[PDB]
JSON list of C-alpha atoms in Angstrom, two decimals:
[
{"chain": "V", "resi": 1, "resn": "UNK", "atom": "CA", "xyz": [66.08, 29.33, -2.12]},
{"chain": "V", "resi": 2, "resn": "UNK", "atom": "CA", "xyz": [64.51, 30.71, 0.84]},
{"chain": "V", "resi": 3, "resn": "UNK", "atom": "CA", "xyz": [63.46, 29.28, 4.07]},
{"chain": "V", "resi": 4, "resn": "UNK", "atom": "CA", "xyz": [59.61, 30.16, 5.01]},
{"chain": "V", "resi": 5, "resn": "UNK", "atom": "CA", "xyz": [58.67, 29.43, 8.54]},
{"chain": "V", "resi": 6, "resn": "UNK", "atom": "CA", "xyz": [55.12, 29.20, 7.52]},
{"chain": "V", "resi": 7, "resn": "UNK", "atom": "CA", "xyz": [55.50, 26.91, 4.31]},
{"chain": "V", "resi": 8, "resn": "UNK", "atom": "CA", "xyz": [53.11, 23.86, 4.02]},
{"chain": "V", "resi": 9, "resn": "UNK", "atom": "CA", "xyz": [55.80, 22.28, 1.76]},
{"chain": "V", "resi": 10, "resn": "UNK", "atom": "CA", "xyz": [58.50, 20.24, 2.99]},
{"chain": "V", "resi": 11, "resn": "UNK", "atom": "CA", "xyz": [61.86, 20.68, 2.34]},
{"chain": "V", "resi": 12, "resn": "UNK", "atom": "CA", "xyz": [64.30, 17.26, 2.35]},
{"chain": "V", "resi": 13, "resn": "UNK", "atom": "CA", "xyz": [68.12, 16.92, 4.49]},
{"chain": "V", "resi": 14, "resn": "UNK", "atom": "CA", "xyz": [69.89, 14.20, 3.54]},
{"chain": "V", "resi": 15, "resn": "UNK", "atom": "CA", "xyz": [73.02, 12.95, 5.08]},
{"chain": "V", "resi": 16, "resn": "UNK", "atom": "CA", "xyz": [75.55, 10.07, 4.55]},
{"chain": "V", "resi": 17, "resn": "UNK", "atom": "CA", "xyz": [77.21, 9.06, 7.53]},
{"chain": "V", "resi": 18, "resn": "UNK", "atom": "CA", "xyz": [80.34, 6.88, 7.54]},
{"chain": "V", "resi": 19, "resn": "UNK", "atom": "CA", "xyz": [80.59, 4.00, 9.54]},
{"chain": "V", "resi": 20, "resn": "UNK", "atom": "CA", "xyz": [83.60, 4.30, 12.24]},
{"chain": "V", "resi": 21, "resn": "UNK", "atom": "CA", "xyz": [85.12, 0.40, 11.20]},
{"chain": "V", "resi": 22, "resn": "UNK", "atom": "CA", "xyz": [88.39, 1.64, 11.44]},
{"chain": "V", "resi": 23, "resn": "UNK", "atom": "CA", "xyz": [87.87, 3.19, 14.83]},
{"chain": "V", "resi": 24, "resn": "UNK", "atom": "CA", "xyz": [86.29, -0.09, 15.92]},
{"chain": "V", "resi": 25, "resn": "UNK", "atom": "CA", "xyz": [88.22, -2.83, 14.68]},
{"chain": "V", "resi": 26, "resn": "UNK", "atom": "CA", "xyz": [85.68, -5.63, 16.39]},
{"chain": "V", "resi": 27, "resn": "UNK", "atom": "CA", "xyz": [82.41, -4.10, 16.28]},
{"chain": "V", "resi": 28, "resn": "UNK", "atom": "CA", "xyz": [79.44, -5.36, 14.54]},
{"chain": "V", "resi": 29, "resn": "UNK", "atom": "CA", "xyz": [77.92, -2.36, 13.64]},
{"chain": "V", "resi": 30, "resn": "UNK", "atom": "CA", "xyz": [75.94, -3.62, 11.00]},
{"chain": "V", "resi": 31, "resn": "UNK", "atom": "CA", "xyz": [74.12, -6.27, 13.06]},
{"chain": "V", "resi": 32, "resn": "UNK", "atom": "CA", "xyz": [73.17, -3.65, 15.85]},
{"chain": "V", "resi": 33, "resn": "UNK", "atom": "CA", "xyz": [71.58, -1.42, 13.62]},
{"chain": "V", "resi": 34, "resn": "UNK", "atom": "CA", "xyz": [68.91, -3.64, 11.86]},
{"chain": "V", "resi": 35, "resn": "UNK", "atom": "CA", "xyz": [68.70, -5.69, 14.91]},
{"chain": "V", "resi": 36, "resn": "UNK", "atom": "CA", "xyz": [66.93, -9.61, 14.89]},
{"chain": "V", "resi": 37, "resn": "UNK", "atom": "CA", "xyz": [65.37, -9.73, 11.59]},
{"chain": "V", "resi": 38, "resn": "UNK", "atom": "CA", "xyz": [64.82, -5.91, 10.49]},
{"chain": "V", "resi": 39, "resn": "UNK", "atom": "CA", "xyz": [63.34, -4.67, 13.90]},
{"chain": "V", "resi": 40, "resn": "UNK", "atom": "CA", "xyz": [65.59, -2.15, 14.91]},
{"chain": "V", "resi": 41, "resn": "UNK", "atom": "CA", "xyz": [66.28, 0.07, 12.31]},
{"chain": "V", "resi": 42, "resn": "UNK", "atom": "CA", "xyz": [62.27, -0.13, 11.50]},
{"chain": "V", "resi": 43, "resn": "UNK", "atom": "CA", "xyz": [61.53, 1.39, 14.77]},
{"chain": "V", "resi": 44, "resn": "UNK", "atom": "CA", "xyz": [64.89, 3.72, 14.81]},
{"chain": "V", "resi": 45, "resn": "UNK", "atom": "CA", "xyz": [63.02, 5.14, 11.19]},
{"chain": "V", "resi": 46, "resn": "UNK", "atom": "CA", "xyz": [59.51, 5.03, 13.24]},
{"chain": "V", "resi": 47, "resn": "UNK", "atom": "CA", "xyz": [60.65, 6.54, 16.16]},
{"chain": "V", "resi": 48, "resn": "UNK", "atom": "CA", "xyz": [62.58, 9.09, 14.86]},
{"chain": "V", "resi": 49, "resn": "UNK", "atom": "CA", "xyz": [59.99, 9.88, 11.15]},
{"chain": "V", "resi": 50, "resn": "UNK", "atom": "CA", "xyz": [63.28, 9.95, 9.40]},
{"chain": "V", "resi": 51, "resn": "UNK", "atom": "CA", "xyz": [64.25, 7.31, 6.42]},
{"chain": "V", "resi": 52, "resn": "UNK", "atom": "CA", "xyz": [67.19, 5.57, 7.24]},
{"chain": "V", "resi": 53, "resn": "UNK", "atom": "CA", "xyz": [69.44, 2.85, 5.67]},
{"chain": "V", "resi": 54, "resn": "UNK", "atom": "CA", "xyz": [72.38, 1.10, 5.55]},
{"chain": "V", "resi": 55, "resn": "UNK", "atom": "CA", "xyz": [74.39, 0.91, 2.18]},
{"chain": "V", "resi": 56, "resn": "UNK", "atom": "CA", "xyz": [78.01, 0.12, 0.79]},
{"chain": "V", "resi": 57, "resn": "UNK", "atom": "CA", "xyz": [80.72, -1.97, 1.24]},
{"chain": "V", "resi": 58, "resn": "UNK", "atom": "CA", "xyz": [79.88, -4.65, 3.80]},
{"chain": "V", "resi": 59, "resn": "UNK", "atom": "CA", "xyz": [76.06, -3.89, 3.92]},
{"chain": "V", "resi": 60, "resn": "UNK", "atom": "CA", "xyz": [75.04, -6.81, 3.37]},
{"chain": "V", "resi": 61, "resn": "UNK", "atom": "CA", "xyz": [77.68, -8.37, 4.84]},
{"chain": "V", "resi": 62, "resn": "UNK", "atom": "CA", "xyz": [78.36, -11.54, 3.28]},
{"chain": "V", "resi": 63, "resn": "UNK", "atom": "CA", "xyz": [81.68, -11.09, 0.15]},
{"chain": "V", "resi": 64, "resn": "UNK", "atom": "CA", "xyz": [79.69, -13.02, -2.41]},
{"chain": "V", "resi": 65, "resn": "UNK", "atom": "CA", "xyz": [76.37, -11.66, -2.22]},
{"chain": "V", "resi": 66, "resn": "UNK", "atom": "CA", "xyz": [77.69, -8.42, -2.50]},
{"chain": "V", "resi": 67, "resn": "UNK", "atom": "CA", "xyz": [80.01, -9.44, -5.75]},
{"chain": "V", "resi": 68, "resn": "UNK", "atom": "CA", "xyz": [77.42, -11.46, -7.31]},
{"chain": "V", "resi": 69, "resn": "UNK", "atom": "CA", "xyz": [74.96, -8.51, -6.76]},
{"chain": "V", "resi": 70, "resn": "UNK", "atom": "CA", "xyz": [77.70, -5.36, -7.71]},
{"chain": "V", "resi": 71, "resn": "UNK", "atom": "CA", "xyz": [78.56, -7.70, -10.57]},
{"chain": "V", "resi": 72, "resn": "UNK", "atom": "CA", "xyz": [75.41, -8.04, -11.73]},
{"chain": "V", "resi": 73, "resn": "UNK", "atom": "CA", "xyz": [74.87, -3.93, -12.43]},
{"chain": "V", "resi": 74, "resn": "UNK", "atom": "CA", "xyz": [71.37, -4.05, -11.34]},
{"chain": "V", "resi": 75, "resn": "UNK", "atom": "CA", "xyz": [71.24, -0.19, -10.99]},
{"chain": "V", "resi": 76, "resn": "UNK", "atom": "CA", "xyz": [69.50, -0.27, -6.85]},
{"chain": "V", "resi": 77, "resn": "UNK", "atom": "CA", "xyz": [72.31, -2.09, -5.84]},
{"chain": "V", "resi": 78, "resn": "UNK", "atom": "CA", "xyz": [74.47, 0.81, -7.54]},
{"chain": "V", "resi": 79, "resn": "UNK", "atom": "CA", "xyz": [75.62, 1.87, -3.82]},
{"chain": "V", "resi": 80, "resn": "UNK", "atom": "CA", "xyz": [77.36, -1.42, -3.37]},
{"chain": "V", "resi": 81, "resn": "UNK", "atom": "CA", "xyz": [80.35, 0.33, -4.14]},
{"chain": "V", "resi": 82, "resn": "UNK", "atom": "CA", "xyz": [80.52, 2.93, -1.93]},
{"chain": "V", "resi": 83, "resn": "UNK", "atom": "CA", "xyz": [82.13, 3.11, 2.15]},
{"chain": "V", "resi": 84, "resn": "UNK", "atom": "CA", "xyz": [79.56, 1.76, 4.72]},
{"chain": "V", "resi": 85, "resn": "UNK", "atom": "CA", "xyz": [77.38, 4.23, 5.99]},
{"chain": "V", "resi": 86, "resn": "UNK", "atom": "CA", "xyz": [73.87, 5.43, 6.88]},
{"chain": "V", "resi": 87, "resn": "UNK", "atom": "CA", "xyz": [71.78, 7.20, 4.97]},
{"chain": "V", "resi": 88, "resn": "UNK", "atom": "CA", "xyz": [69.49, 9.57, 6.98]},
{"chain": "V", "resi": 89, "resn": "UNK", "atom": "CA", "xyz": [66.64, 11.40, 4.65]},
{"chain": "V", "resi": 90, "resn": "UNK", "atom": "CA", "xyz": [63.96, 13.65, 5.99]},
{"chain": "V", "resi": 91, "resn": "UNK", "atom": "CA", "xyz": [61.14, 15.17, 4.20]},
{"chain": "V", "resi": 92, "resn": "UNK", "atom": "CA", "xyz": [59.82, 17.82, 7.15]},
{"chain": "V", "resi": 93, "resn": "UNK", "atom": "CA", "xyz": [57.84, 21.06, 7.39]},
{"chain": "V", "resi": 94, "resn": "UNK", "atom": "CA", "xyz": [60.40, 24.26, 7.15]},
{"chain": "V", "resi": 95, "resn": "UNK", "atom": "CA", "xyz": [59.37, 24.79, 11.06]},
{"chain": "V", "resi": 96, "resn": "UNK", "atom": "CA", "xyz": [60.93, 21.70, 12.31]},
{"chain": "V", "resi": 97, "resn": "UNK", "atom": "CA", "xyz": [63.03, 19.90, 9.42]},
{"chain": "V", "resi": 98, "resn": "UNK", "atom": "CA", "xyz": [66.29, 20.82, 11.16]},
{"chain": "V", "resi": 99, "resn": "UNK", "atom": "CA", "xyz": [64.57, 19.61, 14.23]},
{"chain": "V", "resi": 100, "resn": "UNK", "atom": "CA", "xyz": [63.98, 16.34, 12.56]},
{"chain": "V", "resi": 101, "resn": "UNK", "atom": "CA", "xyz": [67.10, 15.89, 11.27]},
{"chain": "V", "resi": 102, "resn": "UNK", "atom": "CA", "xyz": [68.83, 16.76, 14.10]},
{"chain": "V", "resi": 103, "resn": "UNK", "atom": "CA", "xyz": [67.06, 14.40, 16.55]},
{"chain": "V", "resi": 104, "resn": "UNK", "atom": "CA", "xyz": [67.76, 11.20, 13.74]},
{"chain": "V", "resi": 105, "resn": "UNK", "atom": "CA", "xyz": [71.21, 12.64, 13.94]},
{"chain": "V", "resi": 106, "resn": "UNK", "atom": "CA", "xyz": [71.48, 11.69, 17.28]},
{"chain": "V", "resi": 107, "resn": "UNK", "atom": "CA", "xyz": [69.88, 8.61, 17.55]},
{"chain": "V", "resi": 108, "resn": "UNK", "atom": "CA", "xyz": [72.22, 7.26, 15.00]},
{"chain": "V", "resi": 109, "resn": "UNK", "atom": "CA", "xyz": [75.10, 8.44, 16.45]},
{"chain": "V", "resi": 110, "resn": "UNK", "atom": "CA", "xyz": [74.34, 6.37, 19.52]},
{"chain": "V", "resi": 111, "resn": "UNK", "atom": "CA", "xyz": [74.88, 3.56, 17.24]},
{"chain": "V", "resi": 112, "resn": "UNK", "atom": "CA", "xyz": [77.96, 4.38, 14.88]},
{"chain": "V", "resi": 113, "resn": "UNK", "atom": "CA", "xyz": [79.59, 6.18, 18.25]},
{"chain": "V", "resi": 114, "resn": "UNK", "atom": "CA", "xyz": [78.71, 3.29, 20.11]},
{"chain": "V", "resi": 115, "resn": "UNK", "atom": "CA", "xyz": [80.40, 4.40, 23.68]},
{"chain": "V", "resi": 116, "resn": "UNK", "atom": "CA", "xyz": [79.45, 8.16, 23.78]},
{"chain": "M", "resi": 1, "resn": "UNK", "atom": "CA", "xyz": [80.39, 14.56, -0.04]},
{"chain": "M", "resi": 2, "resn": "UNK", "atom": "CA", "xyz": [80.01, 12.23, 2.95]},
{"chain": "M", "resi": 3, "resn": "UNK", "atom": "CA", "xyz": [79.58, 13.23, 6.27]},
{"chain": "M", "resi": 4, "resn": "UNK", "atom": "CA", "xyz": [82.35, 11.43, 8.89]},
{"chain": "M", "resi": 5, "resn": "UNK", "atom": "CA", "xyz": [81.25, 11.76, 12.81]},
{"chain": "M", "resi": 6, "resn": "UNK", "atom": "CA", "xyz": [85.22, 11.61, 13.46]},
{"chain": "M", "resi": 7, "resn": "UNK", "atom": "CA", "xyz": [86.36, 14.54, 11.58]},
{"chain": "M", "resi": 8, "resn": "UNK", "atom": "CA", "xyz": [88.46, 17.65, 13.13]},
{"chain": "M", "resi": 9, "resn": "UNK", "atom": "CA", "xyz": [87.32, 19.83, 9.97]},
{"chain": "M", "resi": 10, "resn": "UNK", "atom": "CA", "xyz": [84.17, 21.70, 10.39]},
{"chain": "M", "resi": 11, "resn": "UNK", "atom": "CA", "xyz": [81.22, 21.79, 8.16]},
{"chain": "M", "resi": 12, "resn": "UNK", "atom": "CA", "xyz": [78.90, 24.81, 7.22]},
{"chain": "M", "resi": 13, "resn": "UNK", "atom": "CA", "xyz": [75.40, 25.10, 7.75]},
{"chain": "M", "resi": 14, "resn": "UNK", "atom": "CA", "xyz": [73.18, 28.40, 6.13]},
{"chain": "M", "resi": 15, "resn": "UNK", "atom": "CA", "xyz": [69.65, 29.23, 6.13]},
{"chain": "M", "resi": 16, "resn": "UNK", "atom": "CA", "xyz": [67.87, 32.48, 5.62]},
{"chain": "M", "resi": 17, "resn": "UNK", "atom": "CA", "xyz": [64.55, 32.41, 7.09]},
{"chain": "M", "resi": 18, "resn": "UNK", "atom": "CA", "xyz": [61.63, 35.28, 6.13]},
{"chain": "M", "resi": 19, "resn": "UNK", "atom": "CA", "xyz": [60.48, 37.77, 8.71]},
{"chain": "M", "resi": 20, "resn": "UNK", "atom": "CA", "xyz": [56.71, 37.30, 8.46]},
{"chain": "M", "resi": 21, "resn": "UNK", "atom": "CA", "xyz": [55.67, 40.65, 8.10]},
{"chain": "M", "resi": 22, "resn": "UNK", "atom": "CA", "xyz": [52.39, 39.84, 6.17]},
{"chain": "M", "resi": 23, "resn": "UNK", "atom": "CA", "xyz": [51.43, 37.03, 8.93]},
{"chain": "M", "resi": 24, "resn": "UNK", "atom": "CA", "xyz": [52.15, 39.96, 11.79]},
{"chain": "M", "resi": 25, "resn": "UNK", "atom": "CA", "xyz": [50.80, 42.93, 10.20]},
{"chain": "M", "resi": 26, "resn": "UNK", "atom": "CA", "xyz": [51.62, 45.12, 13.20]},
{"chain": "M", "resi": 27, "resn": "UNK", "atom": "CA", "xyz": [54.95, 43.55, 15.22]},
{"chain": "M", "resi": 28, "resn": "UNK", "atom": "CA", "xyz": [58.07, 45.28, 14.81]},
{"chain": "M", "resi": 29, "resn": "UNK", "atom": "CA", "xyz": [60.61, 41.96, 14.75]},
{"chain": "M", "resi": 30, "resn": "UNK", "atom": "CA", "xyz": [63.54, 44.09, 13.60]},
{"chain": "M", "resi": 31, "resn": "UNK", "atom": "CA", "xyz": [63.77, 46.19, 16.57]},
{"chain": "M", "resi": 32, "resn": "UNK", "atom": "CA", "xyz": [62.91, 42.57, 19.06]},
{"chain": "M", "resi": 33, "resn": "UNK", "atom": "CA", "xyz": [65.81, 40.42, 17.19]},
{"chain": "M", "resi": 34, "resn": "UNK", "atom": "CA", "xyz": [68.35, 43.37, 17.79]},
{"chain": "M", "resi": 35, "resn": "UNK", "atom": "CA", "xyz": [67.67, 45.45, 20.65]},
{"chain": "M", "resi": 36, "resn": "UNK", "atom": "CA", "xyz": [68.95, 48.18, 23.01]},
{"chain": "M", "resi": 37, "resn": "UNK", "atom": "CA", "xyz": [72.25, 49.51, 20.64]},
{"chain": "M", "resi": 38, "resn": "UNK", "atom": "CA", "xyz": [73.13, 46.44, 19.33]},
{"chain": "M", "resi": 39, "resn": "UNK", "atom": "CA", "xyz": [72.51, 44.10, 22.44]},
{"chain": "M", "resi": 40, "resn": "UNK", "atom": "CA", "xyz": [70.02, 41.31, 21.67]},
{"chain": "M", "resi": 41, "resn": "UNK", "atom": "CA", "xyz": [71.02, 39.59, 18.51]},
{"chain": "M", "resi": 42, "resn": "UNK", "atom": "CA", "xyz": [74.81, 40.03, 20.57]},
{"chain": "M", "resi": 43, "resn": "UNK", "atom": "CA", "xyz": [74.14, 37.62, 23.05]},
{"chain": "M", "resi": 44, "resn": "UNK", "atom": "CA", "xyz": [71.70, 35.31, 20.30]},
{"chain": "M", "resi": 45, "resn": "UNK", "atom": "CA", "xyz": [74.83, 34.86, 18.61]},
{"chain": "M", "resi": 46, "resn": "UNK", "atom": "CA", "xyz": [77.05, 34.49, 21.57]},
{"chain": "M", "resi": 47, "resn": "UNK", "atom": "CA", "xyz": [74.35, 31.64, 23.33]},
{"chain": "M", "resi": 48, "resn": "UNK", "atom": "CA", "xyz": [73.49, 29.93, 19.99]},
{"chain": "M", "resi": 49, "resn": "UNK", "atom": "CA", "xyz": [77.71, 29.72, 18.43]},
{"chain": "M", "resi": 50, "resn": "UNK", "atom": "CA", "xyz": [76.07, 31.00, 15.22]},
{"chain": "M", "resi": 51, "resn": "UNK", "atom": "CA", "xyz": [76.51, 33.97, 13.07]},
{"chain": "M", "resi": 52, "resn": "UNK", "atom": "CA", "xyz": [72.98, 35.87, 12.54]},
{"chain": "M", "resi": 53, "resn": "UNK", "atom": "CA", "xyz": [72.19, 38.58, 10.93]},
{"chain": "M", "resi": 54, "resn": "UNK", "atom": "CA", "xyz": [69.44, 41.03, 9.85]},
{"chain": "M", "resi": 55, "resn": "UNK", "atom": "CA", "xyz": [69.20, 41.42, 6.02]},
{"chain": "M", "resi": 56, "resn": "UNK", "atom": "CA", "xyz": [66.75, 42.49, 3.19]},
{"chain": "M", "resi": 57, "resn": "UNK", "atom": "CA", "xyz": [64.23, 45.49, 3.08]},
{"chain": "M", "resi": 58, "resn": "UNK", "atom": "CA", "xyz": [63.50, 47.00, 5.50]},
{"chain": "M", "resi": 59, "resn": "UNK", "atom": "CA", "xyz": [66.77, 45.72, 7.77]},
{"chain": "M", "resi": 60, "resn": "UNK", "atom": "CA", "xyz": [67.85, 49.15, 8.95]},
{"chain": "M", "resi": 61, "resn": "UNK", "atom": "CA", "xyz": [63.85, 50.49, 9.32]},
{"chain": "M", "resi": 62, "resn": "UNK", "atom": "CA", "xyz": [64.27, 54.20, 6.89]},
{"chain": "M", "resi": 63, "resn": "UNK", "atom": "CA", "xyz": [63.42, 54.24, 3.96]},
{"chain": "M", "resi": 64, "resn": "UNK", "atom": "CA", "xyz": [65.98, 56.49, 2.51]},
{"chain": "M", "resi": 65, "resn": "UNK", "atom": "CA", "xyz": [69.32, 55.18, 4.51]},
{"chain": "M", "resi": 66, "resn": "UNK", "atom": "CA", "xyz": [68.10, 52.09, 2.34]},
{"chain": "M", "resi": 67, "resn": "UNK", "atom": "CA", "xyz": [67.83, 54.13, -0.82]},
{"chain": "M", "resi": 68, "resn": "UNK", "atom": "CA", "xyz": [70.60, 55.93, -0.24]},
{"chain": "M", "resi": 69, "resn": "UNK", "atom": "CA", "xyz": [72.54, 52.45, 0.52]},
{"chain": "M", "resi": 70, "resn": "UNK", "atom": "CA", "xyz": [70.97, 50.38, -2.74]},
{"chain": "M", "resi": 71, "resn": "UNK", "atom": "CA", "xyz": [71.87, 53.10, -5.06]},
{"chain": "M", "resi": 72, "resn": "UNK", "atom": "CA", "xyz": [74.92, 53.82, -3.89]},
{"chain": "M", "resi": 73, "resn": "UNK", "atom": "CA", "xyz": [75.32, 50.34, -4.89]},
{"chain": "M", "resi": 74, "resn": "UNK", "atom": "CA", "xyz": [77.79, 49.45, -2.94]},
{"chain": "M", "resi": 75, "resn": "UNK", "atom": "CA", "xyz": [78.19, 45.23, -2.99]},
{"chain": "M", "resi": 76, "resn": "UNK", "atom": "CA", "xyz": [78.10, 45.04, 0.77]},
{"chain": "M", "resi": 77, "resn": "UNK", "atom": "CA", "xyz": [74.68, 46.54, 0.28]},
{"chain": "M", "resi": 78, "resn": "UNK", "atom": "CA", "xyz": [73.20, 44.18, -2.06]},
{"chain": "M", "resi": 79, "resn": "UNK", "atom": "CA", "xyz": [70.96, 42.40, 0.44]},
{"chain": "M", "resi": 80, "resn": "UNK", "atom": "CA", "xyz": [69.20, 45.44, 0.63]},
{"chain": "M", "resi": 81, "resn": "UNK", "atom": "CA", "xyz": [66.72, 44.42, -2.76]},
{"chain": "M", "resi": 82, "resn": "UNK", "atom": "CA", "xyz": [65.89, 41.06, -0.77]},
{"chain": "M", "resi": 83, "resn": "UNK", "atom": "CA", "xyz": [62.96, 39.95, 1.32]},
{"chain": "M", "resi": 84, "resn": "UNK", "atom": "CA", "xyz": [63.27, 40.97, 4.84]},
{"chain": "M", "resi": 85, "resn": "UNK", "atom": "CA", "xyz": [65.25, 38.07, 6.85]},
{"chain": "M", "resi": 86, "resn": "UNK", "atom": "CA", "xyz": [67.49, 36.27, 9.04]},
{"chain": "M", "resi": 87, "resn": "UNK", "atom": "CA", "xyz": [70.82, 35.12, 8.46]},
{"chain": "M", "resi": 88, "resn": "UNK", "atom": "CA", "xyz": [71.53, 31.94, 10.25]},
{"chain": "M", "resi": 89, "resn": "UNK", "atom": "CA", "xyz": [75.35, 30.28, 9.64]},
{"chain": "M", "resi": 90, "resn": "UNK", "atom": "CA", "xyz": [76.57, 27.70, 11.69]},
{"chain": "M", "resi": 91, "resn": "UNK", "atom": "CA", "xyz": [80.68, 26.52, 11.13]},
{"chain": "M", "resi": 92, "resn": "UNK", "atom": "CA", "xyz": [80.62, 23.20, 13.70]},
{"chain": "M", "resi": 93, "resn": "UNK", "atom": "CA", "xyz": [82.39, 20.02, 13.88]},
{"chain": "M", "resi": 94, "resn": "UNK", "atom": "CA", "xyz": [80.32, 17.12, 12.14]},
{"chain": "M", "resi": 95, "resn": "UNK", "atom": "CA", "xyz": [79.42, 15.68, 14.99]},
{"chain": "M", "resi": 96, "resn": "UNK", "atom": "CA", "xyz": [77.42, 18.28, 16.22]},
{"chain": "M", "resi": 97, "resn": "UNK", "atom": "CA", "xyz": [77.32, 20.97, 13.23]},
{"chain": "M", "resi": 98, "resn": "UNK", "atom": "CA", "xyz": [73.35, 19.64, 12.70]},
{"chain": "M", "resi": 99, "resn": "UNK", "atom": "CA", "xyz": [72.53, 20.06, 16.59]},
{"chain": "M", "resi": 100, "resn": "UNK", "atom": "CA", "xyz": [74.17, 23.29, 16.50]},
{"chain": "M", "resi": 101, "resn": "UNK", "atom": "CA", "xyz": [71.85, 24.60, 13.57]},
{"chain": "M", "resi": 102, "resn": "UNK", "atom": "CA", "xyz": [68.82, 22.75, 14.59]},
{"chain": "M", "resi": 103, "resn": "UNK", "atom": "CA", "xyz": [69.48, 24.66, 18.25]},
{"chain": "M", "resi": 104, "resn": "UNK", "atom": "CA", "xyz": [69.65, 27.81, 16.37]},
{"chain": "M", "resi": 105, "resn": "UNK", "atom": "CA", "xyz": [67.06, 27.81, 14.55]},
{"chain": "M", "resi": 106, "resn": "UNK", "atom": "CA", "xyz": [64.92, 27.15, 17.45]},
{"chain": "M", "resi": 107, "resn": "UNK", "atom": "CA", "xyz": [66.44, 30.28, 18.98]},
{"chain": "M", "resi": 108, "resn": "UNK", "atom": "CA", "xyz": [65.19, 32.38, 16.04]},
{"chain": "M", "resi": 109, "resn": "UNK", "atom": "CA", "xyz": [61.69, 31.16, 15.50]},
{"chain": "M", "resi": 110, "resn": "UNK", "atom": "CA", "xyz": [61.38, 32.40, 19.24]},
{"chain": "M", "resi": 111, "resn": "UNK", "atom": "CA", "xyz": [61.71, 35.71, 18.05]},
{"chain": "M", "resi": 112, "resn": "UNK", "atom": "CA", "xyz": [60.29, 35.06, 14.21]},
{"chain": "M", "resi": 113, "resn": "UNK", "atom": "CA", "xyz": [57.07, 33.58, 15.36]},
{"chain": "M", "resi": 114, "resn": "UNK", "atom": "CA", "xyz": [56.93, 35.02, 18.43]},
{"chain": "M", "resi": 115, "resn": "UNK", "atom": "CA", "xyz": [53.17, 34.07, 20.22]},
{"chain": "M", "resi": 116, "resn": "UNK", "atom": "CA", "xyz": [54.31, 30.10, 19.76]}
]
C-alpha cells in the first residue's frame, strides 16, 4: 500500500532469523534465549513489545520429542521442519513500527551474535 | 525467505510515506525536504545511506509542468497521478538493513511531521 504517518492502524514486520550453529559449533543458543524455565525470552518479548519465538530444527532440543511431535503432523508443530531460528513479529503504529522492529532486531542479535 | 545475520548479500527495504498536507493545511514540506537548488534532501540521503525521493502531485509545485509531464505520459512520469510522498529505499547488509531503515525513517518524519 501506502505508509500513513498518522494511521491509528498498525501495520505487522515479521522476520525469521537463522540461528548462527554453524558459526558456533559449541554454543547453546537455545538455552540462552529462553533462559531458566521461560524467563528470558518472556521479558526479551516484554521489554522489547515485540513477539518472539524460537522454532525449527533443534527447538526443542531433545531428537525424539521433536520426531515423535513432526511425526505426529499436528499442524502447530508444522515449523518443526524448518532451520532454527527466531521469529520476531511486531504489530506497531505506522509512526514507530520500524522503530519497533528495529530495536527487537537488536536485542536479538545480542543473542544469535553472541560476541558483538 | 529467511533472514541470515551472516550474509554478504544485501536486502531491500521500501516505504512511501504521505506528505500530510490535509493535517498541515498551510506548511510547504516540498520546498523544506529539498531545499536551496537541490541541497537538503542531498545531504538526507548522503547522512541516512538511503535513496529518497519526492513523488506524487504536487512533487515539482506547478500545476502545468505536472500536466504537461502526466500527459505527455512519459513512464518516468507516472508517479505524477499519486498522492504526494516520500520515497524511502534502503539496500543494507542483513545485519543492519532494519537499523538502517528504521534510522531513516526517523530522519524523514523530522521533516514530515515537523512540530514533533
Amino acid at each position: 500500500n501506502y505508509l500513513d504517518l498518522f494511521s491509528h492502524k498498525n501495520m505487522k514486520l515479521k522476520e525469521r532469523v537463522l540461528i548462527p550453529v554453524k558459526q558456533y559449533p559449541k554454543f547453546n543458543f537455545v538455552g540462552k534465549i529462553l533462559g531458566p524455565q521461560g524467563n528470558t525470552i518472556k521479558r526479551l518479548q516484554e521489554e522489547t513489545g515485540a513477539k518472539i519465538s524460537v522454532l525449527g530444527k533443534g527447538s526443542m532440543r531433545d531428537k525424539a520429542k521433536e520426531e515423535e511431535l513432526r511425526k505426529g503432523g499436528d499442524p502447530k508443530y508444522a515449523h518443526l521442519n524448518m532451520d532454527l531460528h527466531v521469529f520476531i513479529e511486531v504489530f506497531g503504529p505506522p509512526c514507530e513500527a520500524y522503530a519497533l522492529m528495529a530495536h527487537a532486531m537488536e536485542e536479538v542479535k545480542k543473542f544469535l551474535v553472541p560476541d558483538m
